[PDB]
Amino acid sequence: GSESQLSVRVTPANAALKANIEAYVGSLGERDEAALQRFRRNAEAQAEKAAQALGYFQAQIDSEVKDGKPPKLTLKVVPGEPVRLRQVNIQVLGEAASLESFRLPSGKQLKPGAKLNQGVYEDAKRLIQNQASRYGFFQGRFSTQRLSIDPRAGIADIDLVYDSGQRYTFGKVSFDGDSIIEEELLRRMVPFKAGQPYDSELIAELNQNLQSSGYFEGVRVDAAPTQARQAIPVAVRLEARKPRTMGVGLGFSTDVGARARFNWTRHWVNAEGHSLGFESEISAPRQNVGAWYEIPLDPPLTDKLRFTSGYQFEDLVDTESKLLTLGGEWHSKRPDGWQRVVSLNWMREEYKLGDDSGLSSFLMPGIGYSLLETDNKVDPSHGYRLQFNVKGAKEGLLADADVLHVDAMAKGLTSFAGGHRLLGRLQVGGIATNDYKSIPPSLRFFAGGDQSVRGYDYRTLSPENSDGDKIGGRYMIAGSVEYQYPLAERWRLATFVDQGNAFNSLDFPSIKTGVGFGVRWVSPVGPLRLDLAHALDDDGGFRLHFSMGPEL
Numbered sequence: 001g002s003e004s005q006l007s008v009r010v011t012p013a014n015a016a017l018k019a020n021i022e023a024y025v026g027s028l029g030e031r032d033e034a035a036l037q038r039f040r041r042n043a044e045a046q047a048e049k050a051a052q053a054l055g056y057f058q059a060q061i062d063s064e065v066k067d068g069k070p071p072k073l074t075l076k077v078v079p080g081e082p083v084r085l086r087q088v089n090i091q092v093l094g095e096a097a098s099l100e101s102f103r104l105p106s107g108k109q110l111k112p113g114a115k116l117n118q119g120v121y122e123d124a125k126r127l128i129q130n131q132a133s134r135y136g137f138f139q140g141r142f143s144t145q146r147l148s149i150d151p152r153a154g155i156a157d158i159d160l161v162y163d164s165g166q167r168y169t170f171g172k173v174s175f176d177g178d179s180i181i182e183e184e185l186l187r188r189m190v191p192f193k194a195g196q197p198y199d200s201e202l203i204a205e206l207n208q209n210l211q212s213s214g215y216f217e218g219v220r221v222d223a224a225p226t227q228a229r230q231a232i233p234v235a236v237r238l239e240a241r242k243p244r245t246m247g248v249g250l251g252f253s254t255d256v257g258a259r260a261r262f263n264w265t266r267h268w269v270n271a272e273g274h275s276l277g278f279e280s281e282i283s284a285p286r287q288n289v290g291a292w293y294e295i296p297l298d299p300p301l302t303d304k305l306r307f308t309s310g311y312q313f314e315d316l317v318d319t320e321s322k323l324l325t326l327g328g329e330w331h332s333k334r335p336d337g338w339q340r341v342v343s344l345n346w347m348r349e350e351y352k353l354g355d356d357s358g359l360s361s362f363l364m365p366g367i368g369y370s371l372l373e374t375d376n377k378v379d380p381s382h383g384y385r386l387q388f389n390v391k392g393a394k395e396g397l398l399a400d401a402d403v404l405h406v407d408a409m410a411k412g413l414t415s416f417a418g419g420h421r422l423l424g425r426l427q428v429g430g431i432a433t434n435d436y437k438s439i440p441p442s443l444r445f446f447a448g449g450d451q452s453v454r455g456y457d458y459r460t461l462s463p464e465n466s467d468g469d470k471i472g473g474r475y476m477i478a479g480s481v482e483y484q485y486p487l488a489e490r491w492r493l494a495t496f497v498d499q500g501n502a503f504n505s506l507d508f509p510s511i512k513t514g515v516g517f518g519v520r521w522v523s524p525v526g527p528l529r530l531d532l533a534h535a536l537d538d539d540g541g542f543r544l545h546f547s548m549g550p551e552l
């Protein structure tokens with residue numbers, strides 16, 4: 001201690017007004033009677049601002065200042081009935097009058113008869129000007145912005161007439177900078193054609209496009225407007241990235257432990273925008289190395305070819321595997337957001353399941369679909385992810401066995417009330433075959449872990465053989481529901497239930513259940529999560545899970 005507690009008395013009770021006054025006055029701070037006495041005129045001023053802000057203008061307040069441990073100041077507030085809107089005229093004229101997606105100011109708070117709330121007028125004004133600016137009505141004017149308050153007789157009039165004038169348009173797109181990327185390529189990632197209606201979110205989209213292309217270390221995408229129609233030219237300057245970039249990352253997980261990730265990427269090999277890359281990751285239970293080549297199709301960023309090769313060693317609970325892979329991928333995304341990937345992958349796997357050593361190889365075609373819909377990036381308000389992937393093989397036809405491998409995931413997040421979050425997770429997997437023994441670990445299914453079924457260690461939920469070794473399931477499911485309570489900014493308190501298992505028979509899934517609670521912390525890289533989970537099934541003890549990365 002000590003800090004001098006603020007006190008608001010509203011007769012008769014009005015929680016809204018009270019909380020507003022409390023927010024407006026702010027913190028009294030530490031001591032004292034005298035300092036509080038000086039603060040009184042400010043306190044009454046702020047309080048009456050808050051009343052005026054909620055429509056109470058025949059607001060009559062009184063300050064009281066008491067001393068003690070700590071001190072305190074009691075404001076008595078009394079609110080004459082509020083000022084209700086009589087006339088409200090909100091008009092958007094000009095070209096904007098005809099724009100479909102131009103939201104007119106609406107809602108309960110701007111209806112006649114309603115108590116005047118702080119900034120509803122300004123909210124409306126801000127909305128109009130924001131959409132004006134988004135859609136390129138730069139010659140857009142407020143012909144009329146009148147707010148009238150007669151506290152007495154309790155009347156308020158709103159008048160917003162907004163002449164938007166003519167709409168500007170996208171001009172030429174120009175590219176300068178030490179980039180060797182052909183303008184043929186750069187123009188196919190401009191998300192607009194010339195003579196098309198201006199949209200600042202399209203400029204943003206272009207900026208993020210160029211940034212995400214990997215081609216540069218910097219882009220200056222600017223389209224400032226011009227005087228009193230025209231056509232706003234867009235200037236893009238590109239700094240070719242250093243031709244060979246290196247990156248190193250450290251991470252940790254309960255699943256795999258300490259982890260190191262490295263990448264050494266060439267972001268442009270030639271003028272046609274081809275991309276080269278290498279990457280590896282080292283952890284005690286798993287080490288892998290990969291190389292890749294990418295060819296932008298059209299659009300370059302959502303449609304592409306990706307060739308890959310890889311080697312991976314893995315020693316987990318009762319299984320070992322050296323896995324070699326080559327592959328070709330074709331990414332294409334439709335306007336929904338549905339990204340398809342058509343693949344042809346060859347794999348050879350040297351493995352030890354329990355004490356039984358195998359080696360098998362498959363050439364499998366596959367098709368996948370993905371969908372990601374979020375509020376944005378670093379933690380979003382609400383969103384979801386859908387993922388579907390099928391691959392298969394015919395023995396004889398470059399396959400040691402017949403295979404129909406299917407895996408699917410669904411992730412979801414919603415925020416409601418004052419920031420209460422709900423998280424949902426489902427994952428399903430299945431492999432069909434006429435030779436299960438020939439099926440290597442990578443094609444089998446495992447469960448448990450930070451991102452699977454908490455309360456259980458990584459990939460430990462699995463069928464066992466004669467001697468009690470975890471060998472892998474033909475199918476698996478893992479689901480989770482989590483509730484998050486905002487405790488502070490960047491701080492949340494979660495409770496969760498996960499259920500899942502990997503198993504060979506649909507009739508006896510023997511689903512295991514872990515339940516628990518943890519802490520979420522929003523760092524700048526991402527949401528770190530630390531959970532304490534109790535296994536309800538098998539012989540359940542307690543388990544600490546730790547993980548890094550986005551919620552979705």
Ligand SMILES: CCCCCCCCOCCOCCOCCOCCO
Binds near residue numbers: 385411480
């Ligand atoms: C478009 C929104 C996408 C979000 C979908 C979230 C799906 C989350 O579902 C959680 C329930 O999953 C079921 C888990 O099943 C485990 C085994 O069932 C219990 C058997 O005893």
Ligand SMILES: [Mg+2]
Binds near residue numbers: 179181186
């Ligand atoms: Mg160029």
